[PDB]
Structures are given as structure tokens and as C-alpha cells.
Design a protein around this motif. Structure first.
Motif, short mmCIF file in Angstrom:
data_model
loop_
_atom_site.label_atom_id
_atom_site.label_comp_id
_atom_site.label_asym_id
_atom_site.label_seq_id
_atom_site.Cartn_x
_atom_site.Cartn_y
_atom_site.Cartn_z
N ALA C 60 0.82 -1.21 0.00
CA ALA C 60 0.00 0.00 0.00
C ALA C 60 0.86 1.26 0.00
CB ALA C 60 -0.95 0.00 1.20
N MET C 61 1.99 1.24 0.70
CA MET C 61 2.87 2.41 0.71
C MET C 61 3.32 2.77 -0.69
SD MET C 61 5.36 2.43 4.01
CE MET C 61 6.27 1.09 3.23
N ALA C 62 3.43 1.78 -1.58
CA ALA C 62 3.78 2.04 -2.97
C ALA C 62 2.70 2.81 -3.71
CB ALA C 62 4.07 0.73 -3.70
N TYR C 63 1.50 2.92 -3.13
CA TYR C 63 0.42 3.68 -3.74
C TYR C 63 0.25 5.05 -3.11
CZ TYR C 63 -1.32 -0.56 -6.13
OH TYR C 63 -1.46 -1.67 -6.93
N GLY C 64 1.09 5.40 -2.14
CA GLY C 64 0.96 6.65 -1.44
C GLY C 64 0.35 6.54 -0.06
#
Ligand SMILES: [Mg+2]
Ligand SMILES: [Mg+2]
Ligand SMILES: [Mg+2]
Ligand SMILES: [Mg+2]
Ligand SMILES: [Mg+2]
Ligand SMILES: [Mg+2]
Ligand SMILES: [Mg+2]
Ligand SMILES: [Mg+2]
Ligand SMILES: [Mg+2]
Ligand SMILES: [Mg+2]
Ligand SMILES: [Mg+2]
Ligand SMILES: [Mg+2]
Ligand SMILES: [Mg+2]
Ligand SMILES: [Mg+2]
Ligand SMILES: [Mg+2]
Ligand SMILES: [Mg+2]
Ligand SMILES: [Mg+2]
Ligand SMILES: [Mg+2]
Ligand SMILES: [Mg+2]
Ligand SMILES: [Mg+2]
Ligand SMILES: [Mg+2]
Ligand SMILES: [Mg+2]
Ligand SMILES: [Mg+2]
Ligand SMILES: [Mg+2]
Ligand SMILES: [Mg+2]
Ligand SMILES: [Mg+2]
Ligand SMILES: [Mg+2]
Ligand SMILES: [Mg+2]
Ligand SMILES: [Mg+2]
Ligand SMILES: [Mg+2]
Ligand SMILES: [Mg+2]
Ligand SMILES: [Mg+2]
Ligand SMILES: [Mg+2]
Ligand SMILES: [Mg+2]
Ligand SMILES: [Mg+2]
Ligand SMILES: [Mg+2]
Ligand SMILES: [Mg+2]
Ligand SMILES: [Mg+2]
Ligand SMILES: [Mg+2]
Ligand SMILES: [Mg+2]
Ligand SMILES: [Mg+2]
Ligand SMILES: [Mg+2]
Ligand SMILES: [Mg+2]
Ligand SMILES: [Mg+2]
Ligand SMILES: [Mg+2]
Ligand SMILES: [Mg+2]
Ligand SMILES: [Mg+2]
Ligand SMILES: [Mg+2]
Ligand SMILES: [Mg+2]
Ligand SMILES: [Mg+2]
Ligand SMILES: [Mg+2]
Ligand SMILES: [Mg+2]
Ligand SMILES: [Mg+2]
Ligand SMILES: [Mg+2]
Ligand SMILES: [Mg+2]
Ligand SMILES: [Mg+2]
Ligand SMILES: [Mg+2]
Lengths: 68, 155, 114, 97
Positions: C60-64
Motif C-alpha cells: 500500500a505504501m507504494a500507492y501513497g
RNA sequence: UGGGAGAGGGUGGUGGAAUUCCCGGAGUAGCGGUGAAAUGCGCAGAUACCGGGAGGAACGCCGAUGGCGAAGGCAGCCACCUGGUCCACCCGUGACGCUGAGGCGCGAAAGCGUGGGGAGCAAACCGGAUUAGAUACCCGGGUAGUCCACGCCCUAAACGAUGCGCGCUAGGUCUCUGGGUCUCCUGGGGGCCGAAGCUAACGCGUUAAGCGCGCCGCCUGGGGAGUACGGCCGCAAGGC
């Protein structure tokens, strides 16, 4: 720290006294034990029975999400 | 055993290097109680890692010990109805002992003929990083890393 | 992309599934004890959950994703380790609530819980 | 292999064979019958039939007494079945919890 | 006469949690399950998450060593209809009483008939495991049934394995529900421990299994056998 102490006289049947009644519920909306309310067996029954009607009228919850 | 931790034997230092660990290796070489043989096989190798490598046997020796010391090992345990491979941390006594054991063992698999040659050449490959001696350590460790899922079943 | 959202932990005796959603509860991504590579009863351990939580944050962190209120359901063993992993991941974890479903004595349960 | 010892009695290859046909019951469990040994004897009350057998999961040891020689052999096999069947299924109990 | 407590019973309503299914969204490589697994489910988009909806059944906390009932049994909440019982005044009747072969009624579950309902669960059944084998235990499915109305069946570890009533024989303690004059005193229940006494012992002991009276049921070595024959009951199963 018993609940009945932190409360002067109150009606054990006034199902519309949300303010007093809500204290007799745990942080998960459950009816607190006698060990935690200090009501005798005789009076603890009338508390629960009026919490249950208060819930039906909508003034009290049936359960609450536990936060941390 | 069943009443108390048996005490680890201290071993007298040797006379060619005065080290307590050079001795504990000498023993692991020794077969049928012939320690005089255990000495001259080890020492001949010390000459070797000097002839072919301009450095210190005792330096090569000890570094190879820290190169085979298995930090993590598995140690089986039957949980419920399965013998799982629980990953135990290793005691530095045991790390010593397994390293010394695996050296001679990984050495006594080598092809060259005279023992002293195999002991130097295996310490000459463990002190560097290669060798079947280190492989045992690296294998044993990956066997515990792969099974860290059960690391909670430890005692 | 969404900076704030919800992280759900469905923690059962067999597995720990973790899904991260938006503020409106719709999943952005999810991991699980199988996703990170385990089969069978391994999918239940805390390390299993720990990998699924971290692969869920990583995802999820890769999506902001930055902030996540945490929601937990079930009394699995890998539960408390899933929440640690979310915090030690780098996600603003603004809350933990436990919406574990308890029935008020409703449907009769299977023979193995009686 | 299968060894038979008649102590202080004489028997026959036929009788000795009947023992082998009777130990074969323990093959039902499909586990290794390592050096099974049948000792026969005669008390003043009737025959005694001894047996020591070791398996991958333990040994079996019993004794069957009776007047009838062959009936002692069955009781010996009767008790050997029970010890073997326990060896094969005892470890199955403590799987849970 | 005037009060109390209570899941006592019946009828009609209605509350919230959870499961399942369907619908919408969002999302992807697994999920589920076990001692470990496999069947099963899933790229024909599952699980996990959010919203909408349908439906049946059971009522979390309170809830207890608790309360009520003659027993079986009774638990969300509201209202109606209704039973049993305890208390206090010591007003009324005037031995009107106890028991009770027959009879009658009630009688957990399972099962039966007609109709409805069916979410969850689950005999039979199917499949996966386990195993020497596994018509089982464990796992994934699944029909009766579980639920409502009416009518049957009438059984039980229907147990306190202790029939009912009355009287009499230390007390300590915990609890429920009343009444005082509220420290405490006393009534009615629920336990525990113990005086005397009982008991083969274990144990009972003002809730007798003690000491007494009345009445009822019942026992008379184990198996055969709760079987057979007969008779009555039942749709049948099967009951007496
Ligand atoms: Mg050796
Ligand atoms: Mg080796
Ligand atoms: Mg290498
Ligand atoms: Mg699992
Ligand atoms: Mg022989
Ligand atoms: Mg001889
Ligand atoms: Mg002979
Ligand atoms: Mg037999
Ligand atoms: Mg046995
Ligand atoms: Mg009255
Ligand atoms: Mg279905
Ligand atoms: Mg959908
Ligand atoms: Mg939904
Ligand atoms: Mg309870
Ligand atoms: Mg009770
Ligand atoms: Mg008068
Ligand atoms: Mg008069
Ligand atoms: Mg009567
Ligand atoms: Mg009668
Ligand atoms: Mg009935
Ligand atoms: Mg029924
Ligand atoms: Mg039928
Ligand atoms: Mg039928
Ligand atoms: Mg029917
Ligand atoms: Mg029909
Ligand atoms: Mg159906
Ligand atoms: Mg089957
Ligand atoms: Mg099979
Ligand atoms: Mg077969
Ligand atoms: Mg089966
Ligand atoms: Mg099943
Ligand atoms: Mg099912
Ligand atoms: Mg049928
Ligand atoms: Mg039918
Ligand atoms: Mg039925
Ligand atoms: Mg009926
Ligand atoms: Mg009972
Ligand atoms: Mg009674
Ligand atoms: Mg009887
Ligand atoms: Mg009775
Ligand atoms: Mg009182
Ligand atoms: Mg009072
Ligand atoms: Mg009563
Ligand atoms: Mg009393
Ligand atoms: Mg007593
Ligand atoms: Mg006495
Ligand atoms: Mg007597
Ligand atoms: Mg008393
Ligand atoms: Mg008295
Ligand atoms: Mg009584
Ligand atoms: Mg008696
Ligand atoms: Mg009677
Ligand atoms: Mg007789
Ligand atoms: Mg019968
Ligand atoms: Mg007849
Ligand atoms: Mg009959
Ligand atoms: Mg009868």
C-alpha cells in the motif's frame, strides 16, 4: 472504584436517564458485573432490565467497538 | 545431565603456540589416543599455510574458526504430531565444538593424501571463506532461517 | 492514491489475512500468510502474519498510503504480531479498534465448537 | 530369521512350521519382525510358549501357558498381537493438543 | 385484608448482534481446513473489506454457588390473559384434615400425521484423511429433522438414582426473597460444614439417610428378560 459510589441517588427504573445509565456500561457497551456496580442482586436486576429497554428506544448501545 | 550442568573441561595451553583453542583442535585430530601424532599433523599444516601463504597459521587457524562458527542451528522438536525443525541459537561452546569437528571432517574428505596437507588446505580455505567446512555452517544456518516461522516454539 | 485509509486484520487460528483499504473501506491491496509463501499450518504463525502485514504495508505504501487506522478481527495467534509489524513498517497507524464479531448467541455452531 | 527352540522337549519340523504359520498373524501390521524367537517348554501343569520379537518401534515379549500345547501357542500370539498393536497406535493419541 | 419476589404458564407484538445467500462497489492468488494433510472453494475473480437487501433460528453482557415450577422444563424487550408461592395484621370459618388402588390431566428429546417454514446445524448418505484396516473418531459436502400451528407418541441417568404430610432432636457459615425496632431479631427458599443420632462403609444430619405417626408405590439371587404368550394403547415406531 465502584459505579454506585460516583452517583448520588437515582431512579433504577428511569430508562430515559441515559447519563446515569451509560456509566453502568463497560467501554464495550456491556452491562457491568455486580462486582463493578455495587448493586445488590435485587437492584442489579432492575438496572439491567432498564438498560435493555433504553437500548430498544435507542438511547443506549448494544455493543461498542473496542479502541486502544 | 539429570542433576546439574556438567562443567566444561579447561584444557592446558599448548607449547608451540600456548593457545587453548589450538589444543582443542589437536584433540579433534587425535585418533586412538595418539596425541604426538595429533601434534605433528597439525603443525606440519602450520608450516604449510606458511610455505604457500606468507601469513600466520594461528591467524589463519582462528579466522577459520570464526568462519565455521554456526550462529544459528536447527534443533528438532515434536510439537503436537509433527517433529518440527525449531531454530535454536547456538552456544559459543557448541559453535567452537562444531567448527573444530566439521573442519577435520570437511578436511578428511579432501583428495590429497597426507593428513597435514588436508588440514592446512581446509584451514586455508575456511580462513578465506570457501571450503566444505564453511558450507556446513552456511547450510545449517539457512536451515534455521528457512524455519524461523517456528522460532516461537523455542524453549 | 490515498494517504489515509484502513488496515484490516482478519486473524484466525489457521491464517492471518490483512487488507488495506481507502477511507471508504474499499481495498487498495491485501496480503496473507499464503501470499508471502506458506502452506498449511505455517500460514497461522506470527512470522506468517508478520510477513503478510509487512508485504501489505510495502504494497500500500507504494500507492501513497501513509496513515492507516487499524481494524482487527478474530483471536488468532498471529494477531498481536500483525499490529506490531504495521507500526514498525512506517505507516502513521492512527488507531487500533477490534471489531471482532461476537454473536449474541445466534446460529448454532459446528460440532467442533460445542 | 525366524528361530524356534524346544527346551527339554522334542518337536517336529511339522510342529515347528505350525509355529511359523502362527507368528504370521503379526505380519498383519506390516512392520518389521526382527529376529523373532519362540521358546517352547513343558511345566508339570502344561506347556509354556515364550516369545521375544523386536520391531522398529519396540520389542514384544509375552508368555502363554495352557494344557494344550497349541492352545498355549495361540495365547502367546494373543498377547503378542496386543503388545504390537499398542506399539503401532500408542503414539497416535497425543497428537492434540 | 393489605404487601413482595420470580427465565412459572399462554397470546399478540417488537429490538439488536452474528451466520448464510443475493445485489452494488473495490480489489487479487489464493482461501479454507488439520496433529500434519487432502478432498472442497478460487483468474468463469474466491478469501479479506465497504454499502444495499432477504430470511430463519438463537438471545451476548447482565448471568450467579442465582431465581421459578408439582415434575418434564422455563432466559432479549414490550403489553394483555393466567397459575403457583412467601410476608405482614392475627379479622372471618370451625378439624372443613393427611394420604391416595383405580380414574383424569401434564409429561425433555427423538419419532409420527396434515400443513407451513428452512439461516445455522446435522442422523442417513457422499467424498477426503487417519489407519494394518477405519462402514468411526478428524475434514469437506449433505437429506430427514432441528423451527411455527394442530393432532399423536408417553419414553429417559424423567436423578437428589432419596414418595407425600405432620410432629420432635446443637450450632457455624455463605446466599435469595420478604418483615421488624434494620446492631440484630425473625419467616420462606438455595447451598456448605458440623451436635446427638443413623449407616456395611461411602456418607446423611432442622433441605435426615436421625427420632416418631399415618397413607401410597416398590423389592425378595445373577442370566434368560423388560423377552414370550395374553390383554389394553398406538397411524406406525413402539408403549403398559
Ligand atoms: Mg570426528
Ligand atoms: Mg559434516
Ligand atoms: Mg561460499
Ligand atoms: Mg492454515
Ligand atoms: Mg530355530
Ligand atoms: Mg537342544
Ligand atoms: Mg525337536
Ligand atoms: Mg485375535
Ligand atoms: Mg493393551
Ligand atoms: Mg393476597
Ligand atoms: Mg445450504
Ligand atoms: Mg461482489
Ligand atoms: Mg456484507
Ligand atoms: Mg455465562
Ligand atoms: Mg440452580
Ligand atoms: Mg379469630
Ligand atoms: Mg366462633
Ligand atoms: Mg393429594
Ligand atoms: Mg392413579
Ligand atoms: Mg412428549
Ligand atoms: Mg420434539
Ligand atoms: Mg421416518
Ligand atoms: Mg416421517
Ligand atoms: Mg414433522
Ligand atoms: Mg406419508
Ligand atoms: Mg435447506
Ligand atoms: Mg464417508
Ligand atoms: Mg482411506
Ligand atoms: Mg477393506
Ligand atoms: Mg467418513
Ligand atoms: Mg461432518
Ligand atoms: Mg456444514
Ligand atoms: Mg428419511
Ligand atoms: Mg417425513
Ligand atoms: Mg422432532
Ligand atoms: Mg407439538
Ligand atoms: Mg441433573
Ligand atoms: Mg425432588
Ligand atoms: Mg426409576
Ligand atoms: Mg421422585
Ligand atoms: Mg434476612
Ligand atoms: Mg430489609
Ligand atoms: Mg424451588
Ligand atoms: Mg434456611
Ligand atoms: Mg454435610
Ligand atoms: Mg458424631
Ligand atoms: Mg433406621
Ligand atoms: Mg442449620
Ligand atoms: Mg430449635
Ligand atoms: Mg426444602
Ligand atoms: Mg438408608
Ligand atoms: Mg405415593
Ligand atoms: Mg431370577
Ligand atoms: Mg423398553
Ligand atoms: Mg402382543
Ligand atoms: Mg415393551
Ligand atoms: Mg415404567
Amino acid at each position: 472504584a465502584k459505579v454506585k459510589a460516583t452517583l448520588g441517588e437515582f431512579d433504577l427504573r428511569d430508562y430515559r436517564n441515559v447519563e446515569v445509565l451509560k456509566r453502568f456500561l463497560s467501554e464495550t457497551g456491556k452491562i457491568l458485573p455486580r462486582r463493578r456496580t455495587g448493586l445488590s442482586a435485587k437492584e442489579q436486576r432492575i438496572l439491567a432490565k432498564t438498560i435493555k429497554r433504553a437500548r430498544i428506544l435507542g438511547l443506549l448501545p448494544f455493543t461498542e467497538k473496542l479502541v486502544r | 545431565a539429570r542433576r546439574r550442568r556438567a562443567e566444561v573441561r579447561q584444557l592446558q595451553p599448548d607449547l608451540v603456540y600456548g593457545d587453548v583453542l589450538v589444543t582443542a583442535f589437536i584433540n579433534k585430530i587425535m585418533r586412538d589416543g595418539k596425541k604426538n601424532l595429533a601434534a605433528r599433523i597439525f603443525y606440519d599444516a602450520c608450516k604449510i599455510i606458511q610455505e604457500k601463504t606468507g601469513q600466520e597459521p594461528l591467524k589463519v587457524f582462528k579466522q577459520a574458526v570464526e568462519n565455521v562458527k554456526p550462529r544459528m542451528e536447527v534443533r528438532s522438536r515434536r510439537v503436537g504430531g509433527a517433529n518440527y525443525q525449531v531454530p535454536m541459537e547456538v552456544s559459543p561452546r557448541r559453535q567452537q565444538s562444531l567448527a573444530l569437528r566439521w573442519l577435520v571432517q570437511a578436511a578428511n574428505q579432501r583428495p590429497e593424501r597426507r593428513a597435514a596437507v588436508r588440514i592446512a588446505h581446509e584451514l586455508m580455505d575456511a580462513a578465506e571463506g570457501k571450503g566444505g567446512a564453511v558450507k556446513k555452517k552456511e547450510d545449517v544456518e539457512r536451515m534455521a532461517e528457512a524455519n524461523r516461522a517456528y522460532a516461537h516454539y523455542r524453549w | 492514491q490515498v494517504a489515509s485509509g484502513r488496515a484490516y486484520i482478519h486473524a484466525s487460528y489457521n491464517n492471518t489475512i490483512v487488507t488495506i483499504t481507502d477511507p471508504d473501506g474499499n481495498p487498495i491491496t491485501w496480503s496473507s500468510g499464503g501470499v508471502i509463501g506458506y502452506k498449511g499450518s505455517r500460514k497461522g504463525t506470527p512470522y506468517a502474519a508478520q510477513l503478510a502485514a509487512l508485504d501489505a504495508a510495502k504494497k500500500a505504501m507504494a500507492y501513497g498510503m501513509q496513515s492507516v487506522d487499524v481494524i482487527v478481527r478474530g483471536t488468532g495467534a498471529g494477531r498481536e504480531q500483525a499490529i506490531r509489524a504495521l507500526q514498525a513498517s512506517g505507516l502513521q497507524v492512527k488507531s487500533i479498534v477490534d471489531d471482532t464479531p461476537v454473536p449474541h448467541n445466534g446460529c448454532r455452531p459446528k460440532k467442533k465448537f460445542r | 530369521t525366524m528361530n524356534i527352540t524346544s527346551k527339554q522337549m522334542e518337536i517336529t519340523p511339522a510342529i515347528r512350521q505350525h509355529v511359523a504359520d502362527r507368528l504370521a498373524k503379526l505380519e498383519k501390521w506390516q512392520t518389521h519382525l526382527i529376529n523373532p524367537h519362540i521358546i517352547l517348554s513343558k511345566e508339570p501343569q502344561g506347556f509354556v510358549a515364550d516369545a521375544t520379537i523386536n520391531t522398529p518401534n519396540g520389542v514384544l515379549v509375552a508368555s502363554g501357558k495352557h494344557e494344550d500345547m497349541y492352545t498355549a501357542i495361540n495365547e502367546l500370539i494373543n498377547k503378542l498381537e496386543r503388545q504390537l498393536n499398542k506399539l503401532q497406535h500408542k503414539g497416535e493419541a497425543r497428537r492434540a493438543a
